[PDB]
Design a protein around this ligand. Structure first.
Ligand SMILES: [Ca+2]
Ligand SMILES: [Ca+2]
Lengths: 122, 122
């Protein structure tokens, strides 16, 4: 669920997820088109593609089971669709942390008109 | 950066870049489709293809290092991506100057639906 995803981004980056990531670049908001603007945005692009692959449950609005073991996020439960969603979210929140070095504030509420037409393929 | 591209265009063609070039043909505007209508538009098509080949930086918002040396634009800096962007802009500035003799005012704000369906490849 969206709020579990937000918990993981806050924990992994220290950044409050909504102003810092919900509108970043060409892919971090609802939708997405064009070419990813930088690595953070490319994290959002892989996360969008990861969600498109989920058949069987709602990626944005169902809850999954995860817990924190020794500094890392562990996706569990016995529903394979929900755990698949959890793995998308975990992967994106780690990717955000690893690309915190190139994070540009100029891309934080990026104008959708600046995103190319030619959308990158997954 | 876009503004640096515009300065090179004014200096090479003497025309004020937006009015004369920002909407020309099927490729000088944002996006582009169809085939190039003439040689100025093909300058724009090569420049769109040039920006598509750039990753690592942002063609529109990053400012690169360049200078004039004896009536020639010279791209420098030690960041290879940005110099590529500079090189893409310099070539189109020169290409618009070299094709001012077929610049058709009829293509100045050319309706994009008039552009053919099968886009040319880079
Ligand atoms: Ca998105
Ligand atoms: Ca164009």
């Amino acid at each position: 669920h969206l709020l579990q995803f937000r918990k993981m981004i806050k924990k992994m980056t220290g950044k409050e997820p909504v102003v810092s990531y919900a509108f970043y670049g060409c892919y971090c908001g609802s939708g997405g088109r064009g070419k990813p603007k930088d690595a953070t945005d490319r994290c959002c692009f892989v996360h969008d593609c990861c969600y498109e692959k989920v058949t069987g449950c709602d990626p944005k609005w169902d809850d999954y089971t995860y817990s924190w073991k020794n500094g890392t996020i562990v996706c569990g439960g016995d529903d394979p669709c929900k755990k698949e969603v959890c793995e998308c979210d975990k992967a994106a929140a780690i990717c955000f942390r690893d690309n915190l070095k190139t994070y540009k504030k100029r891309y934080m509420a990026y104008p959708d008109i600046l995103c190319s037409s030619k959308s990158e393929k997954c």
